[PDB]
Amino acid sequence: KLKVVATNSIIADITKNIAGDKIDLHSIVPIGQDPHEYEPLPEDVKKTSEADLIFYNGINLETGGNAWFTKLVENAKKTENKDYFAVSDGVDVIYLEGQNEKGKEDPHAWLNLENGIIFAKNIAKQLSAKDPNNKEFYEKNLKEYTDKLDKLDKESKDKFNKIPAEKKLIVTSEGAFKYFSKAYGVPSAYIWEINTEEEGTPEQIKTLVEKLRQTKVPSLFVESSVDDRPMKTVSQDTNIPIYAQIFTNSIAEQGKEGDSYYSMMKYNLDKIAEGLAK
Template sequence: MRGITQSKARYSWQALVVVLLGLWIGGCTKVDSNSTSRARDGKPRVVATSTILANLTEEVGGDEIQVTGILKPGTDPHVYEPVPADSRVLEEANLILYNGYNLEPGIIKLMKASGGKARQLAVGEVVKPLQLDKGKGEVVPDPHVWGSAENAIAMVNAIRDALIELSPEDKEEFTQKALQLTKELKQLHSWTIQQIQTIPADKRKLVTTHDAFQYYGRAYGIAIAGTLIGISTEEQPSAQTVQRLVESIKKIGVPAIFAETTINPALIKTVAQEAGVTLAPRQLYSDSIGAKGSDGDSYIKMIEANTRTIVEALGGKYTPFQPNK
């Protein structure tokens, strides 16, 4: 009798262990399932392709979201080749924000092929693009839409709306942060116009490595007088192209031309030497914000740094940007 009682007790204990183990496994499975859609802390996962988009998204999203940027500061989106880790990040995302207009062709191709179910938003394509002639009758949209702070406002609004759709409970937070950022961008826009106007009128001409400043030029009243290559850095300039640019620089009489942080400056240095002009001592941020701690490590600081570089090199008078918060 005692043996039967002990056997029953053992059986009851084993059954209890099985039930508890099942509950524990079920709980773990539930946590793992949630982690595939949200970060461990419960925040929505947002992936931004470019450093510019990542920065604007962080400003609007604040602490309510987890932002992962695929490109690092100084990386050229035109020629970037994705790595396996990029595929994993895209598959785990709740929302993917990319520039569009074929700025980041490698990432766009990977994104379209990924198995994730995240919404994909081409933030740059909320802006009506400039159409640039690549020659031989080929016209393409210019992807460098962020060159104008007014365009950046449209991008911020698109990011805000996408985040609200993703996390409706944080609508007020996203709305307030977007309003504050928009206020500062409007001030930046007006300040940049004023800064460029300090450059002598006959010197308001910009010569850069690649054709990334058309929106900036049109918004702020400075002509794009020449570029070494077109809108994509995949292009390789011929000797004839280099020589034509040298001759053009001599004719227009600009005091300086500009290199860019995402492109090897060797060839534009040669152009400057042959044309007998100065290569501006500071490089322009074109397709990426600067590394953390640099003078261009946010979108707003990037536009300010570029404006300072242009104004000082072309004979204007630079006054630091001081927004009213």
């Protein structure tokens, strides 16, 4: 079978929904770990060296900081846009501090569903190019999968559009929800910016408290993958409850709620639409 490597569980899950058992699939970053600044293990090196097709997020997720993915493909003698492909190719990129420069792309594109669809379309295209025998199969799965994502996307947009606008603010610890904000029409507020060295300092917490005091936002949220003590402090200091934990950069373990890209997103969308309507 085609040997495929995905850098993280979101990409791997989307890939599974396109390819089913037609491929040999290895995922590098395990469920619940952070795909930024990961350390590949020997099995990852072996699988990537053997791979026919390699998918990564791109837009600086795996190539910033320690640039682990770059090191991995260079050692594996794999070539950009021949062996390995950024599944974010084609997304409408957001830049940190709104400054369009290479390296300032915000990586968190999958947190709106239109980009999950783009991810899937890129995955299907490259599976089909490397394994034409199964092209019809990949394309059928692509349509089914992207239909599923599109329905959820439209339903969620309809819900957000109904919420009184004074309540519409997505508050999280890290500013990782800017693509979500763009797509669903819900402005972002947060304790610390992407790629900040110190997470959850007194300066940062105070800043967010002072902003939220002037708002009517009814719920805050917290990422399952961050230390929740800064947001708990913000919650206490503003008297705004934390409604839910939400997913950011990983699906959940198999069998749990959110154990696929689709169900991860449905959980997020469901909890945030619920929480902001309070």
